[PDB]
């Protein structure tokens, strides 16, 4: 295949005819960084008062007419997208047409005062909805040709060994490992049900660092595999349908499935999937499921080995139990409290429900246990070997049937496996159809690795992309395989000491659960 290079044409963002600029910078042999700026804020986009996103046009009438009775005219704005049957996802109830966010914020406060806080509206900018727009956009691209680069792409865990804490920003990770450049990685635990200063953050999905399994597959999801080929060159592959099996056995052969590793909050499974039981075992991004028979393993990568998990789903009722296991596979101790640190090169098992009972039955010190780990991509075994790393995310972008494929991977207008909690149009409108910051990874026909970050949620700077726009950018760039990584406020890119992304959270750059770092 011909050597990958940046196209010279207009990006598939907005109408053809927008202005754009593309910069090129060589960072090292076989490594380049590009920034694309495109478009401009349109006078046809604007700020408005957001009363909410309703599942039907009728469902807003009880509030729209209600607000009209209070003196406020409103506007019903249809979603820019549909479900898999072509039905509109829902309708915003809005009021006003404002040039600035401050005006919309004042208008929202006036509705709150008048309705005695019966309505507490937000604000919304129409450029972020996923309808046709002129932008603007900022797109940041790293390209690494493993046939020419001495640099190596690495999957960096937060602080190296500090899973379960507050994550690590892209900037801090790059400083810690002296990277040439870096981006955020795959999905991670970002729920904060206990109201801590920050959520407790660990990678989720099948996660491998230098052959070591760090977290289990969510189920049915794709990822980016980094391995060494026969020439010793790095090889990136977009893999699909990742699955893991982590099996705990005693010396009599009795077995129990470990659900994952190193995840804070036992019994709670954000993104659902195979680790979840209620309401579904299908993947469902950002949906919070439970497993009240949970079993999670904690090791030296969790809280630097100083402690294991201490949190349990607040809805769980029943027994809890923990086993501490040494490097030889022998039980050291069992007890009904959670949080003991692992022994050197050992681990801690924590269980609820039937898993708690299984662990307590093996609590005698000296009891011999073994853990086996298997990883596969679309049924084919992937060896957990030195030199192999893996990050899971999704959806796969390089497919002809994006909405249907993404739904099968757990990014759907309805929560998979729930009988028609099933409705999911509000989430899907906001995550898939509407524009957000994004990060994505792809591979060109010649093997060049492409890492892409798109700034979002900022109407004067970069509006971000829908999932279909993200897929279009990756195909335009020349990635013949491509997968969406974590987005929204997680998305950022750094080049040397320079932050080239523009994180979208009001509080600034987000600590994330793993990063992709280009090591010199």
What is the 3-class SS of 256-282, one letter each residue? EEECEECCCCECEEEEECCCCCECCCC
Q: What is the CA radius of gyration of the chain?
A: 24
Burial, 333: exposed, middle or buried (Cβ in 10 Å; 0-12, 13-18, 19+)? middle
> Which DSSP helix (H) or strand (E) runs through 517?
strand 515-519
Q: Interior CA angle at 234 toward 9 and 214, to 5°?
A: 110
As given in the structure block, the two tokens for residue 488 are 């929204």
Q: Is 177 helix (H, G, I), strand (E, B) or coil?
A: helix
As given in the structure block, the two tokens for residue 243 are 């699955």
| Number of neighbours of residue 148 by Cβ within 10 angstroms | 14
Alpha carbons 453 and 281: distance in angstroms, whole number? 31
Alpha carbons 6 and 219: distance in angstroms, whole number? 34
As given in the structure block, the two tokens for residue 388 are 């192999």
How far is C-alpha 301 from the chain's CA centre? 20
175 closest CA partner among 430, 498, 466, 483? 498
**8 Å CB contact between 153 and 520:** no
**8 Å CB contact between 256 and 248:** yes
Alpha carbons 33 and 265: distance in angstroms, whole number? 39
**8 Å CB contact between 67 and 107:** no
DSSP string, 198-224: S--B-B-SSEEETTEEEE---SSEEEE
**Tokens 């997680």 sit on residue:** 490
Alpha carbons 268 and 313: distance in angstroms, whole number? 5
Pairing of strands 260-261, 320-325: unpaired
Class of domain 47-128: alpha beta
Omega of the bond leading into 136 within 30 degrees of 0 (cis): yes
Q: Give the determination technique.
A: X-ray
Alpha carbons 520 and 514: distance in angstroms, whole number? 19
| Number of neighbours of residue 100 by Cβ within 10 angstroms | 14
Alpha carbons 111 and 420: distance in angstroms, whole number? 35
**8 Å CB contact between 491 and 437:** yes
Q: Per this entry, what is the length of the chain?
A: 520
Q: Interior CA angle at 442 toward 439 and 443, to 5°?
A: 160
As given in the structure block, the two tokens for residue 309 are 């998990």
The Cα-based distances of 311 to 118, 205, 265, 299, 484 in angstroms read 35, 20, 5, 16, 30
DSSP string, 60-106: GHHHHHHHHHTT---EEEE-S-B-TTS-B--EEEEEEEESSHHHHHH
> Which DSSP helix (H) or strand (E) runs through 137?
strand 137-144
Alpha carbons 92 and 54: distance in angstroms, whole number? 6
Alpha carbons 280 and 276: distance in angstroms, whole number? 7
Alpha carbons 55 and 423: distance in angstroms, whole number? 9
Query: What would you measure as the largest C-alpha separation in the chain, in angstroms?
Result: 74
What is the 3-class SS of 468-486, one letter each residue? HHHHHHHHHHCEEEEEECC
List CB contacts of 207: < 8 A, sequence separation 6 or more. 155, 186, 213, 214, 215, 390, 391, 392, 514
Q: Is 367 helix (H, G, I), strand (E, B) or coil?
A: coil
Which runs of consecutive H residues, i.e. helices, occur in 139-203?
A: 170-177
Alpha carbons 149 and 31: distance in angstroms, whole number? 6
Q: Is 427 helix (H, G, I), strand (E, B) or coil?
A: helix
> Which DSSP helix (H) or strand (E) runs through 114?
helix 101-114
**8 Å CB contact between 454 and 468:** no
**Deposited resolution, Å:** 1.5
Alpha carbons 389 and 153: distance in angstroms, whole number? 10
**8 Å CB contact between 184 and 512:** yes
Pairing of strands 31-38, 389-392: unpaired
**8 Å CB contact between 119 and 439:** no
| Number of neighbours of residue 304 by Cβ within 10 angstroms | 15
> Which DSSP helix (H) or strand (E) runs through 347?
strand 347-352
262 closest CA partner among 189, 335, 319, 316? 189
The half-sphere exposure of 491 on its side-chain side, counting CA atoms within 13 A, is 29
**8 Å CB contact between 141 and 34:** yes
Alpha carbons 207 and 393: distance in angstroms, whole number? 10
As given in the structure block, the two tokens for residue 147 are 């046939």
**8 Å CB contact between 267 and 290:** yes
List CB contacts of 273: < 8 A, sequence separation 6 or more. 217, 218, 219, 220, 221, 281, 282, 283, 284, 289, 410
As given in the structure block, the two tokens for residue 479 are 């990635």
| Number of neighbours of residue 427 by Cβ within 10 angstroms | 19
480 closest CA partner among 445, 441, 440? 445
**8 Å CB contact between 6 and 22:** yes
Alpha carbons 391 and 225: distance in angstroms, whole number? 7
Task: Please provide residue 334's backbone torsions phi and psi, each rounded to the nearest 5 degrees.
Answer: -130, 150
| Number of neighbours of residue 394 by Cβ within 10 angstroms | 27
Strand arrangement of the beta sheet that strand 152-156 belongs to: 152-156, 515-519, 181-184, 493-495, 498-499
Q: Is 371 helix (H, G, I), strand (E, B) or coil?
A: strand
308 closest CA partner among 340, 346, 268? 340
**Tokens 């694309």 sit on residue:** 36
The Cα-based distances of 433 to 78, 140, 193, 346 in angstroms read 12, 21, 27, 45
Q: Which residues pair with 243 in a beta bridge?
A: 376
- Listed by start position, the domains of the chain span 47-128, 139-519
Omega of the bond leading into 286 within 30 degrees of 0 (cis): no
| Number of neighbours of residue 217 by Cβ within 10 angstroms | 28
List CB contacts of 67: < 8 A, sequence separation 6 or more. 51, 74, 93, 95, 111, 115, 119
What single DSSP character describes residue 395?
-
What single DSSP character describes residue 432?
I
**8 Å CB contact between 242 and 217:** yes
List CB contacts of 520: < 8 A, sequence separation 6 or more. 28, 150, 151, 178, 179, 180
The Cα-based distances of 374 to 344, 380, 385, 394 in angstroms read 23, 11, 11, 21
DSSP string, 217-258: --SSEEEEEEEE-TTS-EEEEEEEEEEEEEEEEETT--EEEE
How far is C-alpha 331 from the chain's CA centre? 35
Task: Please provide residue 6's backbone torsions phi and psi, each rounded to the nearest 5 degrees.
Answer: -60, 130
List CB contacts of 266: < 8 A, sequence separation 6 or more. 294, 296, 309, 311, 312, 313, 316, 320, 338, 350, 351, 352
Alpha carbons 243 and 64: distance in angstroms, whole number? 47
**Tokens 């039905």 sit on residue:** 87
């Amino acid at each position: 295949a011909q050597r990958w290079a940046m196209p010279g044409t207009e990006l598939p963002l907005g109408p053809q005819g927008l202005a754009q600029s593309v910069s090129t910078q060589t960072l090292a042999a076989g490594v380049a960084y590009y920034q694309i700026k495109r478009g401009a804020a349109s006078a046809a986009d604007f700020w408005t008062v957001n009363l909410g996103f309703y599942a039907t046009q009728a469902a807003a009438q009880a509030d729209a007419a209600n607000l009209a009775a209070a003196g406020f005219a409103t506007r019903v704005d249809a979603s820019a997208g549909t479900d898999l049957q072509g039905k509109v996802l829902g309708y915003w109830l809005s009021a006003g047409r404002y040039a600035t966010q401050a005006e919309a914020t004042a208008a929202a406060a006036r509705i709150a005062q008048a309705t005695q806080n019966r309505y507490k509206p937000g604000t919304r900018h129409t450029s972020l909805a996923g309808a046709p727009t002129t932008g603007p956009w900022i797109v940041n691209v790293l390209a690494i040709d493993p046939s020419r680069a001495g640099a190596a792409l690495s999957l960096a865990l937060p602080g190296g060994n500090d899973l379960g804490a507050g994550g690590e920003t892209v900037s801090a990770a790059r400083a810690r490992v002296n990277a040439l450049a870096g981006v955020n990685g795959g999905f991670f635990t970002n729920i904060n049900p206990f109201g801590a200063p920050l959520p407790p953050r660990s990678p989720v999905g099948a996660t491998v660092v230098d052959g070591r399994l760090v977290a289990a597959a969510i189920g049915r999801r794709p990822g980016l595999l980094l391995a060494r080929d026969a020439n010793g060159r790095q090889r990136a592959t977009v893999v699909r349908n990742l699955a893991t099996a982590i099996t705990l056995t005693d010396a009599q052969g009795r077995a129990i499935a470990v659900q994952t590793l190193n995840r804070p909050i036992l019994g709670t499974v954000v993104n659902c999937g195979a680790q979840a039981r209620t309401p579904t075992s299908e993947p469902a991004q950002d949906t919070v499921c439970t497993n009240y028979d949970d079993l999670v393993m904690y090791d030296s990568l969790y809280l630097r080995g100083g402690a294991s998990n201490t949190l349990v789903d607040a809805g769980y009722q029943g027994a809890r139990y923990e086993l501490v296991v040494d490097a030889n596979g022998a039980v050291v101790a069992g007890h009904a409290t959670l949080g003991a640190p692992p022994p050197p090169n050992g681990y801690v098992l924590q269980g609820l429900g039937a898993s708690a009972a299984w662990l307590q039955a093996h609590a005698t010190p000296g009891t011999r246990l073994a853990v086996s780990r298997r990883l596969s991509a679309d049924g084919a075994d992937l060896a957990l070997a030195s030199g192999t790393s893996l990050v899971e995310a999704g959806p796969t972008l390089s497919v002809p049937n994006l909405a249907q494929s993404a739904a099968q991977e757990g990014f759907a207008p309805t929560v998979g496996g729930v009988d028609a909690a099933a409705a999911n149009g509000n989430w899907y409108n906001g995550w898939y159809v509407a524009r957000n910051g994004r990060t994505a990874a792809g591979v060109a026909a010649d093997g060049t690795i492409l890492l892409v970050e798109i700034d979002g949620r900022q109407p004067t700077l970069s509006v971000g992309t829908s999932i279909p726009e993200t897929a279009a950018v990756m195909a335009w760039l020349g990635a013949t395989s491509a997968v969406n990584l974590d987005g929204g406020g997680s998305s950022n890119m750094v080049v040397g000491g320079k932050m080239v992304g523009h994180p979208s959270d009001a509080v600034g750059e987000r600590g994330v659960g793993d990063t992709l770092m280009l090591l010199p």
